[PDB]
Design a protein around this ligand. Structure first.
Ligand SMILES: NC(=O)c1ccc[n+]([C@@H]2O[C@H](COP(=O)([O-])OP(=O)(O)OC[C@H]3O[C@@H](n4cnc5c(N)ncnc54)[C@H](OP(=O)(O)O)[C@@H]3O)[C@@H](O)[C@H]2O)c1
Ligand SMILES: CC(C)(CO)[C@@H](O)C(=O)[O-]
Length: 293
């Protein structure tokens, strides 16, 4: 029924391409370097394997797509989206799913309906396959004031890769994800540790949460440092044995998403005159680790 272009055919993109294929939707990948085909290779939670070769980089397929689904790293997002937006119909919604925040600020002139999403699914590259590590929920809603009700997408996507929840205002959700990510990613990348080690660092966590709560406050959302801290510990307790995405990036010598996590927090703090010494130091530490490669 649906025709979807997936931009960013990595771990997340392949997860969605597989799911969308199993429900009989028409899909293609959009790759950085144009190629004969997009190969999709996915090991599901049980152990089953999906192997397909799909259309890639077809501009006509793009011009007649019902949705652009974007599953790029946050620093890759807005240049890639801008370059596809003049071919995609002015009416086709663009759904951004990434960690961090700050991309919407880079996409103010997009004429398409723009949607933002967070997900707790986990998918990992293991050599040449993607492994679906965990199931989860994807929260989606409008990116901007002008973007309307595309809740119909949530219904459709619930039948593809549950669970999916639509929110008329997604901001609170982005901030709560940003808060946990400001804690776990830089600290794990710095200490080279599994998430669960952070349970030994309650003072540092709480210091970061106080800074985040102060900014979220000024951005017009009711929270407290204690509430954010409680949520960080839930996430830590749930993921105790995991290697965070930022630590995985570090270990693998890839560029990190720091500019859209703590980096974005710093941008919002500075815009309001909120001193965030601890987030600043974590940001500098991650940037430094990256300069060693
Ligand atoms: N994986 C997960 O379990 C998970 C869970 C929750 C949230 N997320 C978030 O989702 C986002 C995507 O994560 P991921 O883990 O799926 O990353 P990923 O595996 O690196 O996938 C991104 C893909 O996009 C490709 N790409 C880079 N620039 C492109 C461009 N300009 N045009 C088309 N393709 C391009 C990359 O190829 P190259 O690497 O060759 O450049 C890569 O295959 C991140 O913000 C991440 O934090 C991931
Ligand atoms: C919450 C989180 C930090 C758990 O590892 C995840 O967003 C990640 O790894 O990026």
């Amino acid at each position: 029924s649906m025709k979807i272009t997936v931009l960013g055919c990595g771990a997340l993109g392949q997860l969605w391409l597989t799911a969308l294929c199993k429900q009989g939707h028409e899909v293609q990948g959009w790759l950085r370097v144009p190629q004969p085909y997009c190969s999709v290779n996915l090991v599901e939670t049980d152990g089953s394997i999906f192997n397909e070769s799909l259309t890639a980089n077809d501009p006509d397929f793009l011009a007649t797509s019902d949705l652009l689904l974007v599953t790029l790293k946050a620093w890759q997002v807005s240049d890639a989206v801008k370059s596809l937006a003049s071919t995609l119909p002015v009416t086709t919604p663009i759904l951004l799913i990434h960690n961090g925040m700050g991309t919407i600020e880079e996409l103010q002139n997009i004429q398409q309906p723009l949607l933002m999403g967070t997900t707790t699914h986990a998918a990992r590259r293991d050599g040449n396959v993607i492994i679906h590590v965990a199931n989860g929920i994807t929260h989606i809603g409008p990116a901007r004031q002008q973007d309307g009700d595309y809740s119909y997408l949530a219904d459709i996507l619930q039948t593809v890769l549950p669970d999916v929840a639509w929110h008329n205002n997604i901001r609170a959700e982005l901030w709560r994800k940003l808060a946990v990510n400001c804690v776990i990613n830089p600290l794990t990348a710095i200490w080279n540790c599994p998430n669960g080690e952070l349970r030994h660092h309650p003072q540092e966590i709480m210091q970061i949460c106080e800074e985040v709560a102060a900014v979220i406050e000024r951005e017009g959302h009711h929270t407290s440092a204690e509430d954010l801290r409680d949520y960080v510990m839930q996430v830590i307790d749930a993921t105790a044995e995991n290697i965070s995405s930022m630590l995985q990036d570090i270990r693998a010598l890839r560029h990190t998403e720091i500019d859209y996590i703590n980096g974005f927090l710093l941008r919002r703090a500075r815009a309001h005159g909120i001193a965030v010494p601890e987030n600043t130091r974590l940001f500098e530490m991650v940037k430094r680790k990256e300069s060693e490669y």
